Paper text:
The suppression of caspase activity occurs in the presence of specific members of the IAP (Inhibitor of Apoptosis Proteins) family. In particular, cIAP1 and cIAP2 (cellular IAPs) are indirect inhibitors of caspases activity, whereas XIAP (X chromosome-linked Inhibitor of Apoptosis Protein) is able to directly inhibit both initiator and effector caspases. All IAPs host one to three BIR (Baculoviral IAP Repeat) domains that are critical for their anti-apoptotic activity. In particular, it has been shown that the XIAP-BIR2 domain is responsible for the inhibition of effector caspases, whereas XIAP-BIR3 directly binds to and inhibits initiator caspase-9, which can also be recognized by cIAP1-BIR3.
Author numbering:
A (entry chain A): 246 to 354
B (entry chain F): 248 to 352
Write the structure that this text describes.
């Protein structure tokens, strides 16, 4: 189905990609300019069409990576409720990416 | 993009008062209640069923018949500060726990 609504429980949506090495493999043909090792470690595998990656745990998708963007920071911006993210980076990171993004908000606006 | 605001100050302070909002829905002709949407912070964008919350800047589209507008506001923009002020935290969480029940079917 790959429903739009992400997965903020602990059961990894696509469990067949819970392995790291299974993921960096999907970046075999990766031409885009974000670091693929930093990518997979952040929980992403490549969908093989364009630059679309999905997360293996929350099923969250990302596109149009601007060059040298951080997979980790990006993961937490759009899906602040991913359990594997919470596992890896811990709440403050998640609250920080958001806190700074709530800042260049009102900074002028 | 872009990033909806978890922040406390609204994004379109002009669509703050209810009366300004329902005015967008003067033409509105969809199977979703117009007077419910406006109550929920939303204003019509003119094109399609596309509506937007005045406070967070969330946009919702492809509406289905009888879909509760309050529910969706919570579903897609939980960090919305106006939503919170109108429904309390618990309500928002109920929607998320109910859709996490879906996650195992
Ligand atoms: Zn995730
Ligand atoms: Zn809102």
């Amino acid at each position: 189905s790959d429903r739009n609504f992400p997965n903020s429980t602990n059961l990894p949506r696509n469990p067949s990609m819970a392995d790291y090495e299974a993921r960096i493999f999907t970046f075999g043909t990766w031409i885009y300019s974000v670091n693929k090792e930093q990518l997979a470690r952040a929980g992403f595998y490549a969908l093989g069409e364009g630059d679309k990656v999905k997360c293996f745990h929350c099923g969250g998708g990302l596109t149009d990576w601007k060059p040298s963007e951080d997979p980790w920071e990006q993961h937490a911006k759009w899906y602040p409720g991913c359990k594997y993210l919470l596992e890896q980076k811990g709440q403050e990171y998640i609250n920080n990416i958001h806190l700074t993004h709530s800042l260049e908000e009102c900074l002028v606006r």
